[PDB]
Structure 1
Amino acid sequence: VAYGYPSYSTIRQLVYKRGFGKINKQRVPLSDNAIIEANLGKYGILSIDDLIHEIITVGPHFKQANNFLWPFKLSNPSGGWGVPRKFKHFIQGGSFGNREEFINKLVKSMN
């Protein structure tokens, strides 16, 4: 894996572009705030920004909020990975592992 700390900008683009809901065990694009109202209305979540607000600030209903989001399907980075070999730790010159803030740069290329 390659994980990091996402910023507000990174979360916002992921949901707006790649935001998909797991409703009735089916993957349904959000594309509208009513869909979130139908499912996530139980916890006081109404719009797409309410859902994001639960991600940026780990709110009391993070799990229900997070699980409602489908696993995102990202693309390969637009500018390449930036390294010759992926499967070395980010400290060691590769890509996998914890990179503190550079997941924002990476994910946007993937996004």
Structure 2
Amino acid sequence: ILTPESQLKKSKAQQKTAEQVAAERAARKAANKEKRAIILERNAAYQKEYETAERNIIQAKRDAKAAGSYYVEAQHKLVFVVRIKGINKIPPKPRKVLQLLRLTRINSGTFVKVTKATLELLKLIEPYVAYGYPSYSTIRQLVYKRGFGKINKQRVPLSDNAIIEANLGKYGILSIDDLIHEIITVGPHFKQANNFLWPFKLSNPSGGWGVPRKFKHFIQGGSFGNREEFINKLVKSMN
């Protein structure tokens, strides 16, 4: 009876080995806090070169037509896609591409990356969808409530314990802040990061501010289509 009881003590060691990891995470988190500062500032930093360059730019532009010469900004931006519209009155067609994005039901969500090819595939999907870039923060709010667990386990959520100790992650650090930074930057194997577990299952919008007309496009004045600003507003409502 004594000898297995000594085996139970060892469990106190396992109690240490992860905690040694906890300490590693605290450091990782401190470095990645400066990585957070960069994600926020980068968008702001782009704008500075235009601002620095041009006095000219603004006045001419409000008052009249024409454009001035010298510079121009390119932009990337990753996307989030939510299916507003149901299955009723549609071909299987477009449905099989939904199944491809992994929008299985209404109020399903999948993140997508920055490229022309996705967009073109997204065009067949289009009257399924509201889409756009949610900002750095709204995505943080998005993971916490809607995220789920991986295969080799069932659904187990994105909740606090489960991400820090668990979640597989071959490429890089799974931990809550690290994972979220890394998808948004859309660097190496962040497309493998965006092989989430699998769909975010969104609440219906509160107040129906998330529902402007299903009928309409952002150009008609509805919900449909690409819209950065509106998607962050929309996701907040999905809470």
TM range (shorter): 0.7 to 0.9
Give the CA deviation at 1:103. 0.3
- Please give the per-residue CA displacement for 1:81-100, whole angstroms capped at 9, x wherever unaligned: 46663121111111111113
Mind listing any 5+ residue stretches in structure 1 that lack a counterpart?
A: none
Mind listing any 5+ residue stretches in structure 2 that lack a counterpart?
A: 1-128
Q: Counterpart in 2 of 1:103?
A: 231
TM (norm. structure 1) is 0.82
Question: Cα gap change, 1:68/1:37 in structure 2, threshold over 3 Å: closer, same or farther?
Answer: farther
Structure whose alpha-carbon radius of gyration is higher: 2
- Please give the per-residue CA displacement for 1:33-63, whole angstroms capped at 9, x wherever unaligned: 5546554442121311111012221121212
Question: Cα gap change, 1:2/1:25 in structure 2, threshold over 3 Å: closer, same or farther?
Answer: farther
Question: Cα gap change, 1:84/1:50 in structure 2, threshold over 3 Å: closer, same or farther?
Answer: closer
Give the CA deviation at 1:76. 1.4
**Structure number with higher strand proportion:** 1
Give the CA deviation at 1:23. 2.5
- The answer to whether the Cα contact below 8 Å between 1:34 and 1:46 also exists between their aligned partners in 2 is no
Question: Cα gap change, 1:66/1:25 in structure 2, threshold over 3 Å: closer, same or farther?
Answer: farther
Question: Cα gap change, 1:52/1:83 in structure 2, threshold over 3 Å: closer, same or farther?
Answer: closer
The alignment-based identity, stated in percent, is 100
- The answer to whether the Cα contact below 8 Å between 2:151 and 2:197 also exists between their aligned partners in 1 is no
1:40 alignment partner, SS class? coil
Once residues 212 and 160 of structure 2 are traced to their aligned partners in structure 1, the CA distance between those partners, rounded to angstroms, is: 41
- Larger mean Cα displacement after TM superposition, 79-88 or 50-59: 79-88
* Larger RCO (CA within 8 A; separation ≥ 6): 1
Once residues 7 and 85 of structure 1 are traced to their aligned partners in structure 2, the CA distance between those partners, rounded to angstroms, is: 23
TM (norm. structure 2) is 0.41
